[PDB]
Structure 1
Amino acid sequence: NIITVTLNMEKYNFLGISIVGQSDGGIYIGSIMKGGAVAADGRIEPGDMLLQVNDMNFENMSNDDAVRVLRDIVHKPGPIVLTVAKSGWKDYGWIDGK
């Protein structure tokens, strides 16, 4: 149901995730970039709902506030701990690809 992941932000230098807001319902992992810390770890998937990053818990903030705070946190060097709710969502990428 819930998974917490501590990301290797020394080896990897970026999370490599997009965010989708649903409404406010919450913010969700949209796409994952191969080569980033989240892809490396492997436990988080597209459609998972983001609950907390570091000391910032998103459950009682607006989607826009959540993404604002998330951006600020991920652009400070240092450790990143993400907690998600494991929520049938497949990313096919750009249709203009082979």
Structure 2
Amino acid sequence: MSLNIITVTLNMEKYNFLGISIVGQSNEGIYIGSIMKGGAVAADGRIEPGDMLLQVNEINFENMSNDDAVRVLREIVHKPGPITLTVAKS
């Protein structure tokens, strides 16, 4: 079996939102659920639904409830500067 890791840096200059929902928990992993067409993640085009979310900026997502993962993504999107996502491809 093959594992494909990609790291995606979004400058968030032309987009306010990532435009993602997330599914699953890692305090029992967390995956990209929906991607909305108008957001930074869709514009970049590399991340797809079912990709596993490993890290966003300095936060690891591998010991979190779904609710806490949504909370930390809210905090990151409301902070200035680029957003770096590391995912494992489905």
TM-score by length of 2: 0.83
**Stretches of structure 1 lacking an aligned partner (at least 5 in a row):** 88-98
Q: Identity, % of aligned pairs?
A: 93
After alignment, is 48-57 or 66-75 more displaced?
66-75
Cα contact 1:26–1:63 (8 A) shared by 2: no
Cα contact 2:25–2:65 (8 A) shared by 1: no
Taking structure 1 as reference, are residues 25 and 6 closer, same or farther at Cα in structure 2, changes over 3 Å only? Answer: farther
Taking structure 1 as reference, are residues 38 and 25 closer, same or farther at Cα in structure 2, changes over 3 Å only? Answer: farther
1:25 is displaced (CA, Å) by 6.2
Q: Secondary structure of the equivalent of 1:11?
A: coil
Q: Secondary structure of the equivalent of 2:34?
A: strand
After alignment, is 18-27 or 73-82 more displaced?
18-27
Instruction: Note the aligned Cα RMSD (angstroms).
Output: 1.8
Cα contact 2:16–2:39 (8 A) shared by 1: yes
Taking structure 1 as reference, are residues 50 and 20 closer, same or farther at Cα in structure 2, changes over 3 Å only? Answer: same
Which structure 1 residue ranges, 4+ long, deviate > 3 Å from structure 2? 22-25, 60-64
The answer to which structure has the higher strand fraction is: 1
**Stretches of structure 2 lacking an aligned partner (at least 5 in a row):** none
| Residues paired across the two proteins, number | 87
Deviations 1:46-76 (A, max 9, x none): 0011110001111233443333212211122
Taking structure 1 as reference, are residues 22 and 61 closer, same or farther at Cα in structure 2, changes over 3 Å only? Answer: closer
TM-score by length of 1: 0.77
C-alpha distance in structure 1 between counterparts of 2:70 and 2:80, whole Å:
18
